[PDB]
């Protein structure tokens, strides 16, 4: 059933999510977590290669025809190990963990009506032995901008998301939005790589593209409005100005000179110097006596 048939952009202020489930309002809160660095280089695919997961992944897509359906997460991505398959279908989202034997080039086989806004499934060509986890819920679903954050902590695969309309042709929006918790999956698997799954028709696809960035352990200053919504954030590592704001715990800095940090030259290499003695110690003569 298997078929054997990048550019870079700038993530201005995207990739910020609510770090926990605590309600806060009218407050500036400092938090440390895995966030997408501001003004970073995000890989742009138009393409369904296997990418590294690293510490965490920021995944965004822009499409009109719902071509991107899901993702595969794991290591070897074959029958040898457990892997996570997240796929949206006609009515629901199916999340499974099994020893799946994936196709060399996995996808959903879908055909379209005469009306280009309607489709029906023909087949499934993605791969399911020794299943340990199964979950079903509602679908994860002007162009549609869908942003996801994927984290894997202590066996939990945490998904954050945001779905908004976009009026741009081929890029990410220059503005701020916070992503909300979607689901927390108690899976307990090892994820090092992942792949994006598309719905193709007899195979080609319509116009769609997606962006992949990576999260880093950084400190952010988050601004909560009166409704408990994050409206702004500062990446404290971005520049000396941001560092000052994070130090003062304010989004405004007055004229003057401020001490913000201490610089330190780091060690270039490590050296070890022990004696030029070679003989081994006579412990054997004590214990084997």
């Amino acid at each position: 059933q298997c078929v054997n048939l990048p550019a870079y952009t700038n993530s201005f202020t995207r990739g910020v999510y609510y770090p926990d489930k605590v309600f806060r309002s009218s407050v500036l809160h400092s938090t440390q977590d895995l966030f997408l660095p501001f003004f970073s280089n995000v890989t742009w695919f138009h393409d369904n290669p296997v990418l590294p997961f690293n510490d965490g992944v920021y995944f965004a897509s822009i499409e009109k025809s719902n071509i991107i359906r899901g993702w595969i997460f794991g290591t070897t991505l074959d029958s040898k190990t457990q892997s996570l398959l997240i796929v949206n279908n006609a009515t629901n989202v199916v999340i499974k963990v099994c020893e799946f034997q994936f196709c060399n080039d996995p996808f959903l086989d879908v055909y379209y009506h005469k009306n280009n806004k309607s489709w029906m499934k023909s087949e499934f060509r993605v791969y399911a032995n020794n299943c340990t986890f199964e979950y079903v819920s509602q679908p994860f679903l002007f162009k549609n901008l869908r942003e996801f954050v994927f984290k894997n902590i202590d066996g939990y695969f945490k998904i954050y998301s945001k779905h908004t309309p976009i009026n741009l042709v081929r890029d990410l929006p220059q503005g701020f939005s916070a992503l909300e918790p979607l689901v927390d999956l108690p899976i307990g698997i090892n994820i090092t790589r992942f792949q994006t799954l598309l719905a193709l028709h007899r195979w080609t696809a319509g116009a769609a593209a997606y962006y992949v960035g990576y999260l880093q352990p950084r400190t952010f200053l988050l601004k909560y409005n009166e409704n408990g919504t994050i409206t702004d954030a500062v990446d404290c590592a971005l520049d000396p100005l941001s560092e000052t704001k994070c130090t003062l715990k304010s989004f405004t800095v007055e004229k003057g000179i401020y001490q913000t940090s201490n610089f330190r030259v780091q060690p270039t290499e490590s050296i070890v110097r022990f004696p030029n003695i070679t003989n081994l110690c006579p412990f054997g003569e004590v214990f084997n006596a």
């Epitope: 006609a90 009515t91 005469k114 309607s118 489709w119 029906m120």
Partner: antibody, heavy 125, light 105 residues
Framework: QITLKESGPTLVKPTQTLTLTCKLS??????????VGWIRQPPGKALEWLAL???????LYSPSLKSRLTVTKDTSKNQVVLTMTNMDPVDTATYYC?????????????????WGQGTMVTVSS | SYELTQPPSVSVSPGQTASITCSGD??????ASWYQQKPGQSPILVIY???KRPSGIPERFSGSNSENTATLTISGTQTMDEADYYC?????????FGGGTKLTV
């Protein structure tokens, strides 16, 4: 396999309301992509579509008959029920229920693959 | 309901090809389907989505849909193919069946 069985009154009087039940097996009414339609065929006449219900409780009715047709589904018994009110002698026909193939995205009816055996209903005094 | 017109009957000799037409207003935009009904029996789907057969349907049955006209063709028509043939088309959720074509052999 997939099968559907019609049951209900085979005789009603004029101005009375008829209730027909379609008992189905091989699939559930709660399953995504599932739909069940009702069609009638008067003696010696062509088939006329009445209504169909989707797994998501969305419903379609024939504009000319809509005012007299109500369709609901029993999510526990896997049954589809069609209510037709204010029947006249001219409404005599054989009634069938059948499975509906459904397009996704913009949801639309496609074709009826599996049909039941049907039940004959007469309207008379 | 959606307007759909069929010929009242078709008559062929055994071994010949039968052709049953179906005319509508928007058959060039939507999909057509065909059902074969024998006397005393429920109709069986023969063609769906213009030219696709359900499993179990003989290769004798084919069809097409162009210029707002749909057709069903039976190649090598057998005496067992005698039936009332009906066409159906959906106009954006609006159902309709043709009057039915009586095919004899």
């Amino acid at each position: 396999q997939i099968t559907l069985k019609e049951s209900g009154p085979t005789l009603v009087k004029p101005t009375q309301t008829l209730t027909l039940t379609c008992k189905l097996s091989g699939f559930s009414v709660n399953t995504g992509g599932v739909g069940v339609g009702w069609i009638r065929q008067p003696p010696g006449k062509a088939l006329e579509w009445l209504a169909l219900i989707y797994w998501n409780d969305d419903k379609l009715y024939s504009p000319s008959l809509k005012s007299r047709l109500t369709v609901t589904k029993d999510t526990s018994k896997n049954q589809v029920v069609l209510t037709m009110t204010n029947m006249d002698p001219v409404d005599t026909a054989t009634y069938y229920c059948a499975h509906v193939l459904v397009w996704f995205g913009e949801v639309l009816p496609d074709a009826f693959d599996v049909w039941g055996q049907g039940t004959m209903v007469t309207v008379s005094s | 309901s959606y307007e759909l017109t069929q010929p009242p009957s078709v008559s062929v000799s055994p071994g010949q090809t039968a052709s049953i037409t179906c005319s509508g207003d928007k058959l060039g935009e939507t999909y057509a389907s065909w059902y074969q009904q024998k006397p005393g029996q429920s109709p069986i789907l023969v063609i769906y989505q213009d030219n696709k057969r359900p499993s179990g349907i003989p290769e004798r049955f084919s069809g097409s849909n162009s210029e707002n006209t749909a057709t069903l063709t039976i190649s090598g028509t057998q005496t067992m193919d005698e039936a009332d043939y009906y066409c159906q088309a959906w106009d954006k959720t609006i159902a309709g069946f043709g009057g039915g074509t009586k095919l004899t052999v």
